[PDB]
Short mmCIF file of C-alpha atoms and ligand atoms in Angstrom, two decimals:
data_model
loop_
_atom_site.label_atom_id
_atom_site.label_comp_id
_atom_site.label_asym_id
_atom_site.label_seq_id
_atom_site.Cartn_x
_atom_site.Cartn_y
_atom_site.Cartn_z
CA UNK F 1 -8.29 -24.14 -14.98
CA UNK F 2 -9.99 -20.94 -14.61
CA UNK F 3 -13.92 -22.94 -15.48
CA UNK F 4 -12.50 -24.81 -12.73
CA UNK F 5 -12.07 -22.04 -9.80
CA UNK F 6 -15.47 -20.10 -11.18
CA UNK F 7 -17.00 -23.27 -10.23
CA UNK F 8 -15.28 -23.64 -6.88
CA UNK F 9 -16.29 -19.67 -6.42
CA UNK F 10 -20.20 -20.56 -7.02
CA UNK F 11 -19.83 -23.78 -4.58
CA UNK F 12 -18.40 -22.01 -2.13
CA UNK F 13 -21.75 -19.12 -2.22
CA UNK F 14 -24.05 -22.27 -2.26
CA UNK F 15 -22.58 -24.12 1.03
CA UNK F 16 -21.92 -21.46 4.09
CA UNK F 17 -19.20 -23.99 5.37
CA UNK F 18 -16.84 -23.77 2.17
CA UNK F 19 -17.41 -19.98 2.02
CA UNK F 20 -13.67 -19.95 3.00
CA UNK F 21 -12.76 -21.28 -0.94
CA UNK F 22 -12.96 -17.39 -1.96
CA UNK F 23 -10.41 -16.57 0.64
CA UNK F 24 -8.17 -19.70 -0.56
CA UNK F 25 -8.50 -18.39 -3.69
CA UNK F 26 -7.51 -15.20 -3.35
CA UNK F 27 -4.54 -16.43 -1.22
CA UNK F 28 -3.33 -18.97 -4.13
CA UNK F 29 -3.71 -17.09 -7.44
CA UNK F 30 -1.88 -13.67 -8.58
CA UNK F 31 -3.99 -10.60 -9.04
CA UNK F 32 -4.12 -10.52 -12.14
CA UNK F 33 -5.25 -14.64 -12.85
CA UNK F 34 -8.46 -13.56 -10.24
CA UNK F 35 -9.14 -10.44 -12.43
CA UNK F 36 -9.37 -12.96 -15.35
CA UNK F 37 -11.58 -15.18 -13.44
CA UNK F 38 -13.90 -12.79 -12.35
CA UNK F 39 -14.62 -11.28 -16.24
CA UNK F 40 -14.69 -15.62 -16.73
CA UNK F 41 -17.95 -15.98 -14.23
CA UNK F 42 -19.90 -13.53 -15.67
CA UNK F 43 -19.14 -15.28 -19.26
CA UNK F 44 -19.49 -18.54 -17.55
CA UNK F 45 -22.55 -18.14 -15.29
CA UNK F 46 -24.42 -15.06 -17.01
CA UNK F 47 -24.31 -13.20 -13.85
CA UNK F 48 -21.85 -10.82 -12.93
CA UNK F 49 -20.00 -11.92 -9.45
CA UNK F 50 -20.72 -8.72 -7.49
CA UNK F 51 -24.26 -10.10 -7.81
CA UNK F 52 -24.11 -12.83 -7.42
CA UNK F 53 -21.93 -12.56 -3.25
CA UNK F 54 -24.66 -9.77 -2.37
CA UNK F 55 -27.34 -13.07 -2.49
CA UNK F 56 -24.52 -15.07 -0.60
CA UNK F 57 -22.94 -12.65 1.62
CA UNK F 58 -22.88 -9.87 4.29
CA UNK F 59 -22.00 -6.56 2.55
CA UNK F 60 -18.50 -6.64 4.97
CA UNK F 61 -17.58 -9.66 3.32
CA UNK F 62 -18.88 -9.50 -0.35
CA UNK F 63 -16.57 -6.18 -0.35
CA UNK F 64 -14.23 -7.42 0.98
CA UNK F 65 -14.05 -10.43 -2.07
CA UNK F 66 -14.51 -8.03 -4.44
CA UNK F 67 -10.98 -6.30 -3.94
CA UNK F 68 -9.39 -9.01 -3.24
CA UNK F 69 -9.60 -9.76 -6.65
CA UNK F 70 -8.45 -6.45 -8.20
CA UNK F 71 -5.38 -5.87 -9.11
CA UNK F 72 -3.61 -3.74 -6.63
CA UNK F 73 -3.26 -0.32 -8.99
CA UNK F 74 -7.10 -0.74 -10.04
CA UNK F 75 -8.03 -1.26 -6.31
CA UNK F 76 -6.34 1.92 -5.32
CA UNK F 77 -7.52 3.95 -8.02
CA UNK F 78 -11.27 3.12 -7.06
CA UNK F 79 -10.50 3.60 -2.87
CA UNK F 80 -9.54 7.10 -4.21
CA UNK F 81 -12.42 7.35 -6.01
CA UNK F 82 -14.74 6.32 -3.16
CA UNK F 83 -13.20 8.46 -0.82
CA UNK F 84 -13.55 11.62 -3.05
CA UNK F 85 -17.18 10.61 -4.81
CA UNK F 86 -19.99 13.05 -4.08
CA UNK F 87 -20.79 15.36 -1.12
CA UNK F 88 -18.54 14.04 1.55
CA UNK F 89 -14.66 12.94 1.51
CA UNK F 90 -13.35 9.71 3.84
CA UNK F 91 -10.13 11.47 4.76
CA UNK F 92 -9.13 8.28 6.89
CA UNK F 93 -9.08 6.42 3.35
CA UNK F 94 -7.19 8.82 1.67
CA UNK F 95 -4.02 8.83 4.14
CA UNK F 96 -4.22 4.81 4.41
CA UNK F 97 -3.98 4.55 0.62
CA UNK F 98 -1.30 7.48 -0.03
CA UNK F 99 1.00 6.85 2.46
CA UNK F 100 1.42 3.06 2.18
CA UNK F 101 2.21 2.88 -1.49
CA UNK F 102 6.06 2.74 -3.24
CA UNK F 103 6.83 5.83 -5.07
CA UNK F 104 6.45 4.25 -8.18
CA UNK F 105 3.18 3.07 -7.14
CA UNK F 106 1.66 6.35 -6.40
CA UNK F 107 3.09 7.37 -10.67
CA UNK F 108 1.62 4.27 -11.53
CA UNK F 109 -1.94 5.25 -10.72
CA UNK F 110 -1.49 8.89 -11.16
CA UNK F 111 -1.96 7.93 -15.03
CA UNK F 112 -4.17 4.28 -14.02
CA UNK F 113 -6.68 7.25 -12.19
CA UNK F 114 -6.66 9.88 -15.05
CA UNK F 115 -7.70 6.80 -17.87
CA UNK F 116 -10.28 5.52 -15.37
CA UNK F 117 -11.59 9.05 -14.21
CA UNK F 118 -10.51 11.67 -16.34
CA UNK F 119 -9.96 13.62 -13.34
CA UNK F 120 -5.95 14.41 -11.85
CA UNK F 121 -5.44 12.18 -8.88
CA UNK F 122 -3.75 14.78 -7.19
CA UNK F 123 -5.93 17.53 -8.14
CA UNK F 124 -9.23 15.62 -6.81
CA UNK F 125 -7.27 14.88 -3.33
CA UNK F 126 -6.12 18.71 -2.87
CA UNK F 127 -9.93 20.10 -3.77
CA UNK F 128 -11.67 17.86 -1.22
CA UNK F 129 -8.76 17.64 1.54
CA UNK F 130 -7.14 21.16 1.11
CA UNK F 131 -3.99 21.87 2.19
CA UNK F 132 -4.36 23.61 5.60
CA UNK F 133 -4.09 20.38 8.01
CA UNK F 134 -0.55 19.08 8.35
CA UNK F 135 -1.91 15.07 7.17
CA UNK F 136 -3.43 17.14 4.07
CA UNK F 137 -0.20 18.63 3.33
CA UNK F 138 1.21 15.62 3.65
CA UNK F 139 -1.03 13.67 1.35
CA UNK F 140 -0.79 16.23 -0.90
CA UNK F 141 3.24 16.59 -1.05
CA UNK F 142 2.83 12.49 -1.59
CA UNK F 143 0.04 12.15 -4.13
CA UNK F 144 2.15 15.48 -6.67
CA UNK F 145 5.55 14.35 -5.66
CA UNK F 146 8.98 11.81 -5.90
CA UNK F 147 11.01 10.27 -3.01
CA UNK F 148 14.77 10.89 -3.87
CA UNK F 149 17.93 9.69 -2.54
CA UNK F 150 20.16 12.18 -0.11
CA UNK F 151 23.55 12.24 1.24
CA UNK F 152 24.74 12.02 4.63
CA UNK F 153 24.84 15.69 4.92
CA UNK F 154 21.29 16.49 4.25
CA UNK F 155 20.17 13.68 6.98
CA UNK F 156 22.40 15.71 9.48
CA UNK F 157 21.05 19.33 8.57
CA UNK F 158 17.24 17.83 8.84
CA UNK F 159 18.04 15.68 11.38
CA UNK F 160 18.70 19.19 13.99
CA UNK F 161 15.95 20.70 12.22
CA UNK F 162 13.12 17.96 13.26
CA UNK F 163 14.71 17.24 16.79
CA UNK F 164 14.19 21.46 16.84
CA UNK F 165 10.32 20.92 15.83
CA UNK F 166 9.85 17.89 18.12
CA UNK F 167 10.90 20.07 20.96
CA UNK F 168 8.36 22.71 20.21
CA UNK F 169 4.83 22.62 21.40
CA UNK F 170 2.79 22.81 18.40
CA UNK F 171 3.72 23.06 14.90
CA UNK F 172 5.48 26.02 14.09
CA UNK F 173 5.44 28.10 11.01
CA UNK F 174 9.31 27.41 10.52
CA UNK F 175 8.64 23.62 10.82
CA UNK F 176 6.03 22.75 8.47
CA UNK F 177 8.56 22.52 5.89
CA UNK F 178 10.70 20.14 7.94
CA UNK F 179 7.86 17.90 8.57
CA UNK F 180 6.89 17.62 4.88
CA UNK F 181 9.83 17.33 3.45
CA UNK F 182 11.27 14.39 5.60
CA UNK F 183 7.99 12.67 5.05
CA UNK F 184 6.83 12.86 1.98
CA UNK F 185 10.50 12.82 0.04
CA UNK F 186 12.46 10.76 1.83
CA UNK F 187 13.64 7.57 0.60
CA UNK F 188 12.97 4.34 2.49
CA UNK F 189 17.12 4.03 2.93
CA UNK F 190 17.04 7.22 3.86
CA UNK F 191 13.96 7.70 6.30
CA UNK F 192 15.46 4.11 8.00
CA UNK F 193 18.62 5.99 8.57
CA UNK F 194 17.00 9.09 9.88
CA UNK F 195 15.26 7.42 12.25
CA UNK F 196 18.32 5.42 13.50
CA UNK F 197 20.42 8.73 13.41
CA UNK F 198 18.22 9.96 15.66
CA UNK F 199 18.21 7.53 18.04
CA UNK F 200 22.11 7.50 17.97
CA UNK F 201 22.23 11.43 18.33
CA UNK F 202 19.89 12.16 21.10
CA UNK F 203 20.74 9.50 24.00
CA UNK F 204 18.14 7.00 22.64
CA UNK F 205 15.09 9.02 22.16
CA UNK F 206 12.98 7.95 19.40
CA UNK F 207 11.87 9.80 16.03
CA UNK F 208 8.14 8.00 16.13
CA UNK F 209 7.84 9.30 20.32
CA UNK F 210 8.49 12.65 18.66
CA UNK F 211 5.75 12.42 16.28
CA UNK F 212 3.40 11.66 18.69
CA UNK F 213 4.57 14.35 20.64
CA UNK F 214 4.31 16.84 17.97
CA UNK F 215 0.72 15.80 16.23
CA UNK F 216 -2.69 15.27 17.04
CA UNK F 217 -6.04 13.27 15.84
CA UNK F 218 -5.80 12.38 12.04
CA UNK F 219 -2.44 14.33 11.73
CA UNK F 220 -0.64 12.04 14.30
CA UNK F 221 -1.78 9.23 12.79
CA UNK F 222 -0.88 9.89 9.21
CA UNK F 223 2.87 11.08 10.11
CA UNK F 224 2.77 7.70 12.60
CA UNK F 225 1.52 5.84 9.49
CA UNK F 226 4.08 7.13 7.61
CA UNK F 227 6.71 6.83 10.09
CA UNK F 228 5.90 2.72 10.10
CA UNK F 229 5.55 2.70 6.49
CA UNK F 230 8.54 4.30 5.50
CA UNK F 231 10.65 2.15 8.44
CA UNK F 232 8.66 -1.42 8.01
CA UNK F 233 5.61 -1.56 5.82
CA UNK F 234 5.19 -5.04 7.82
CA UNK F 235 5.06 -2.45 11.15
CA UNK F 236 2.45 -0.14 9.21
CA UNK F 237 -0.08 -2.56 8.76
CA UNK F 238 -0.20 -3.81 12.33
CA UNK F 239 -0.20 -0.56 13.03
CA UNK F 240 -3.58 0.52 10.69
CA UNK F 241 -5.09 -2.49 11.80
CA UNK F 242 -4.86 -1.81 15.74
CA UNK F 243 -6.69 1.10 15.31
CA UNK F 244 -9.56 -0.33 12.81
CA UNK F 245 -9.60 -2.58 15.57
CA UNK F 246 -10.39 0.49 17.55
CA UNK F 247 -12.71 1.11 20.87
CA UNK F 248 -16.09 -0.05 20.98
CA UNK F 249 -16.55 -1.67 17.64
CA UNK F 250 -14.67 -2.20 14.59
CA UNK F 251 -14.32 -0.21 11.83
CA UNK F 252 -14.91 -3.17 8.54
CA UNK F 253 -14.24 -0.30 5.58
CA UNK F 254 -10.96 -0.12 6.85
CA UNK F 255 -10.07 -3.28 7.84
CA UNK F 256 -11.09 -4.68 4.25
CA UNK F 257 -9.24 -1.97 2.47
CA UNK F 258 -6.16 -2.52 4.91
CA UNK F 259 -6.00 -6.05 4.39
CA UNK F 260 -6.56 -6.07 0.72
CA UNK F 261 -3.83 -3.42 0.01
CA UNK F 262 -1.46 -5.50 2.32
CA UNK F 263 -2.00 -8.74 2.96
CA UNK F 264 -0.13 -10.39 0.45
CA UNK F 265 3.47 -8.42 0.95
CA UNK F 266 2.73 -8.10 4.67
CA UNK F 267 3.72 -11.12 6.12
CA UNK F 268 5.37 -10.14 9.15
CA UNK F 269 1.81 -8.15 10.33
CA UNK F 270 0.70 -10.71 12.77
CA UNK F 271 4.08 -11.08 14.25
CA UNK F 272 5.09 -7.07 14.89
CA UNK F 273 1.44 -6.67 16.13
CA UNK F 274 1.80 -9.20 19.11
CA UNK F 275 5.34 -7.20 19.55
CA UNK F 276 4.11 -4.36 19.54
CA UNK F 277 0.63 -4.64 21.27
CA UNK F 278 1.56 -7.64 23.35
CA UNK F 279 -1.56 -9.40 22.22
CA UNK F 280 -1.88 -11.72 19.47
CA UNK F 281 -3.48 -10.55 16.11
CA UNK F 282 -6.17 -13.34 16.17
CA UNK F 283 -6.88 -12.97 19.92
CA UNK F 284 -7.87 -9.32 18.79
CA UNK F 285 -9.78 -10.61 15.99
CA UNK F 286 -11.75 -13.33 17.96
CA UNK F 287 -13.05 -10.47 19.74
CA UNK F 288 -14.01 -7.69 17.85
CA UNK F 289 -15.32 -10.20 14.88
CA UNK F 290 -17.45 -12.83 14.83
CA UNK F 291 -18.48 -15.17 12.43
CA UNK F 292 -17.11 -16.06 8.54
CA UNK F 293 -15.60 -12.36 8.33
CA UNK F 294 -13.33 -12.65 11.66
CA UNK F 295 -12.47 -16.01 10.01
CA UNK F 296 -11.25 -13.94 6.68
CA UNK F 297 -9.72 -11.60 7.76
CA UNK F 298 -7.35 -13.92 10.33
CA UNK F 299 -6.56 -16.30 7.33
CA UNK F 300 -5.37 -13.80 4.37
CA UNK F 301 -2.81 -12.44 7.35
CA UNK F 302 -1.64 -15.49 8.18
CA UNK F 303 1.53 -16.11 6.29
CA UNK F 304 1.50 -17.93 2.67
CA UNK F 305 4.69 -20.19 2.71
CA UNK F 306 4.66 -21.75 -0.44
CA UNK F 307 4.35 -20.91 -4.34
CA UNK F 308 1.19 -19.46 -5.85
CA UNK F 309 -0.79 -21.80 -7.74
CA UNK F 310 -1.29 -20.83 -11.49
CA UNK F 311 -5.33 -20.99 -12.89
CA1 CA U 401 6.91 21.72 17.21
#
């Protein structure tokens, strides 16, 4: 069983063309069975398995191994950690974690961060991000806060209220509550039938247009990211991978952290990013990666469509 996949794990380091195995694996087990096999290795093999990929791997793939086979809470907790660690902060990490995670996600590692850290997961984000930009507010109202359900009513009132702060250039004093509130408290149910409401209400125009409209640089992508996350998680993570797809180069921190938070619930990704962006995902890919890691990061998006395997 699990003596079984640490040895297909240290076959797969020795001959470059099985280094897809670890992918395979990760694609086939739950979480929690690869966490078990990775404590097995080191108890197994007498070397610890971080160690062992840096003599096998390029650092873009070897990190991207390791949290594949985290489970999910652990892996956010230590993105969080990363992104806060020391003299600098990785804002860009801090909105893709915070505002693609379930409610009860985000009070799932609020306590999984204080045991690990003994530091407040909110109160490390607020300190290094403040709360002057309008994606820091928003991370902030997210990372302290609860999504709860609302009537009809409520949707109306806010519903004016944003279509009021879409038309203004700028974010006004007045609408800084609007814009938090909607997105960071909303329900799913609710933020789906916002965004249709709007549509319905104002001759077709669209909520996500409006956002754009509204925000710029890392603001208009964390209330777009939101938007897509709130509306189709499967939309978000096209969405975050376009742009790590971004420009010149490619940006391989994010695309590992993207595709190990997502891949596995995802599975509409590929699809809604050809609809969307009107190429395919792995024509993207092809270009902007070569080699082994373009090759990973196509096959843990491409659909599973069959049972996990059990170790
Ligand atoms: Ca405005």
């Amino acid at each position: 069983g699990v003596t079984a996949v640490v040895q297909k794990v240290v076959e797969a380091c020795q001959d470059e063309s099985k280094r897809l195995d670890l992918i395979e694996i990760a694609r086939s087990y739950p979480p929690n069975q690869l966490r078990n096999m990775q404590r097995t290795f080191q108890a197994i093999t007498g070397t610890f398995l971080d160690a062992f990929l840096k003599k096998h791997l390029s650092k873009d793939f070897e990190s991207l191994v390791l949290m594949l086979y985290k489970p999910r809470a652990q892996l956010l907790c230590e993105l969080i950690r990363g992104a806060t660690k020391g003299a600098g902060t990785d804002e860009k990490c801090l909105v893709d974690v915070l505002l693609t995670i379930e409610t009860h996600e985000v009070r799932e590692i609020r306590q999984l961060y204080y045991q690990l850290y003994n530091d407040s997961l909110g109160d490390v984000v607020r300190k290094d991000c403040g709360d002057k930009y309008m994606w820091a507010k928003l991370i902030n109202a997210v990372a302290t806060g609860d999504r709860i359900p609302r009537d009809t009513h409520e949707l109306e009132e806010d519903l004016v209220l944003v279509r009021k702060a879409i038309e203004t250039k700028g974010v006004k004093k007045d609408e800084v509550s609007t814009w938090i509130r909607i997105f960071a408290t909303y329900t799913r149910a609710d933020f789906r039938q916002l965004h249709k409401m709007y549509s319905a209400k104002y001759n077709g125009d669209s909520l996500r247009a409006g956002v754009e409209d509204e925000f710029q640089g890392l603001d208009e992508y964390a209330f777009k990211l939101a938007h897509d996350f709130l509306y189709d998680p499967c939309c978000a993570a096209a969405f975050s991978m376009n742009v790590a797809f971004a420009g010149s180069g490619s940006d391989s921190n994010r695309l590992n952290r993207i595709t190990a938070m997502h891949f596995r619930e995802c599975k509409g990704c590929k699809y809604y990013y050809k609809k969307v962006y009107g190429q395919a995902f792995d024509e993207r890919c092809a270009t902007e990666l070569k080699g082994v890691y373009g090759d990973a990061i196509k096959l843990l998006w491409e659909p599973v469509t069959v049972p996990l395997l059990s170790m």
